[PDB]
Design an enzyme around this catalytic site. Structure first.
Site, PDB file in Angstrom:
ATOM      1  CG  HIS A  22      -4.092  -5.285   0.697  1.00 36.86           C
ATOM      2  ND1 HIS A  22      -3.675  -4.608  -0.191  1.00 36.86           N
ATOM      3  CD2 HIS A  22      -3.686  -6.211   1.630  1.00 36.86           C
ATOM      4  CE1 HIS A  22      -2.751  -5.042  -0.226  1.00 36.86           C
ATOM      5  NE2 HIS A  22      -1.858  -6.580   0.236  1.00 36.86           N
ATOM      6  CB  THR A  38      -2.795  -8.837  -4.134  1.00 31.58           C
ATOM      7  OG1 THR A  38      -2.163  -7.886  -3.707  1.00 31.58           O
ATOM      8  CG2 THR A  38      -3.446 -10.153  -4.117  1.00 31.58           C
ATOM      9  CB  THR A  39       1.233  -4.456  -5.108  1.00 32.73           C
ATOM     10  OG1 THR A  39       1.939  -5.670  -4.562  1.00 32.73           O
ATOM     11  CG2 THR A  39      -0.161  -4.291  -3.999  1.00 32.73           C
TER      12      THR A  39
HETATM   13  N1  LIG Z   1       0.260  -7.872  -1.086  1.00 32.06           N
HETATM   14  S1  LIG Z   1       0.602  -9.727  -1.688  1.00 32.06           S
HETATM   15  O1  LIG Z   1       0.201 -10.425  -2.307  1.00 32.06           O
HETATM   16  O2  LIG Z   1       0.877 -10.085  -0.070  1.00 32.06           O
HETATM   17  C1  LIG Z   1       2.542  -9.059  -1.766  1.00 32.06           C
HETATM   18  N2  LIG Z   1       2.594  -8.303  -3.311  1.00 32.06           N
HETATM   19  C2  LIG Z   1       3.996  -8.631  -2.781  1.00 32.06           C
HETATM   20  C3  LIG Z   1       4.534  -7.666  -4.230  1.00 32.06           C
HETATM   21  C4  LIG Z   1       6.251  -7.248  -4.257  1.00 32.06           C
HETATM   22  C5  LIG Z   1       6.771  -7.797  -2.710  1.00 32.06           C
HETATM   23  C6  LIG Z   1       6.390  -8.231  -2.189  1.00 32.06           C
HETATM   24  C7  LIG Z   1       4.219  -8.686  -2.151  1.00 32.06           C
HETATM   25  S2  LIG Z   1       3.617  -9.058  -1.174  1.00 32.06           S
HETATM   26 ZN   LIG Z   2      -1.195  -7.717   0.449  1.00 33.86          ZN
END
Ligand SMILES: NS(=O)(=O)c1nc2ccccc2s1
Ligand SMILES: [Zn+2]
Ligand SMILES: NS(=O)(=O)c1nc2ccccc2s1
EC number: 4.2.1.1
Length: 259
Positions: free
Chosen positions: A95, A197-198
């Site tokens: 990010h 976080t997505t």
């Molecule tokens: N940005 S994260 O929390 O590392 C992350 N979010 C997501 C959402 C869907 C699938 C894999 C991940 S890995």
């Molecule tokens: Zn991430």
């Protein structure tokens, strides 16, 4: 279909309308208050075992780029630290911001870093990633802050391929990449229970956030910012500010591995 993003009308403040867990009790990222985080002498050193990591492909998924690994066997695993059992590396992504003063998801005493790297691992006791994300101990995400200074030599292979995956849905072969080249010297960390976080924002992650940032050059991060959120031929929307702001800590305790 999915329709969320980081734009002016579909960004993080809107996600709760389709993903109500966005206002849940264990959301990520968070601000790490370094004075309030307690040293936990029961935490173990982290064991990052990436010697046999097998990268396969890099993909622009419209929200970041993912470097994907072969996770059909225990080739690259994370163990120890706050973890029970064995977590297999599946992908990493970053990010980042439009300028160096923002970009990270986690913050440290409210400081934002220029970017943040997430190395995603799933608990092998659940058999596949899709089952792991339905469990409170399903994922372990190693988070590493990026600051702008000297170049990171081990990142250059990633930056150099970005021109070939400019737009959403493009991918390229990305074999033989060594993720050990993205680590800082120290593995001292903070840890707390949180979420993706997505979207879908599932509350399935043990976060392990390294204290020591890695340094990348301005030229390297500028190349991240040339990527596009849009697909080929569509109006250009630069892929920048693809970070979710800090969320309420609620009941949770952040623990430190170090004194
Ligand atoms: N940005 S994260 O929390 O590392 C992350 N979010 C997501 C959402 C869907 C699938 C894999 C991940 S890995
Ligand atoms: Zn991430
Ligand atoms: N972020 S979201 O709640 O998933 C969201 N989805 C949509 C769809 C169309 C227009 C705005 C938004 S905002």
């Amino acid at each position: 279909a999915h329709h969320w993003g980081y734009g002016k009308h579909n960004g993080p403040e809107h996600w709760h309308k389709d993903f109500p867990i966005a206002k849940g009790e264990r959301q990520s990222p968070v601000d790490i208050d370094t004075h309030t985080a307690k040293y936990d002498p029961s935490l173990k050193p982290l064991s990052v075992s990436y010697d046999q990591a097998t990268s396969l492909r890099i993909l622009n998924n419209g929200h970041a780029f993912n470097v994907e690994f072969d996770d059909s066997q225990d080739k690259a695993v994370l163990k120890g630290g706050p973890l029970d059992g064995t977590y297999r590396l599946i992908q990493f992504h970053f990010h980042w911001g439009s300028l160096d003063g923002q970009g990270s998801e986690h913050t440290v005493d409210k400081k934002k870093y220029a970017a943040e790297l997430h190395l995603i691992h799933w608990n092998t006791k659940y058999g596949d990633f899709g089952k792991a994300v339905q469990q409170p101990d399903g994922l372990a995400v190693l988070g590493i802050f990026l600051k702008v200074g000297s170049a990171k030599p081990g990142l250059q292979k990633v930056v150099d391929v970005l021109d070939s995956i400019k737009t959403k849905g493009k991918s390229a072969d990305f074999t033989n990449f060594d993720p050990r080249g993205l680590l800082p010297e120290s593995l001292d960390y903070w840890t707390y229970p949180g979420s993706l976080t997505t979207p879908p924002l599932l509350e399935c992650v043990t976060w392990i956030v390294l204290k020591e940032p890695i340094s990348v050059s301005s030229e390297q991060v500028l190349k991240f910012r040339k990527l596009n959120f849009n697909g080929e031929g569509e109006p250009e929307e630069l892929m920048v500010d693809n970070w979710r702001p800090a969320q309420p800590l609620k009941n949770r305790q952040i623990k430190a591995s170090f004194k």
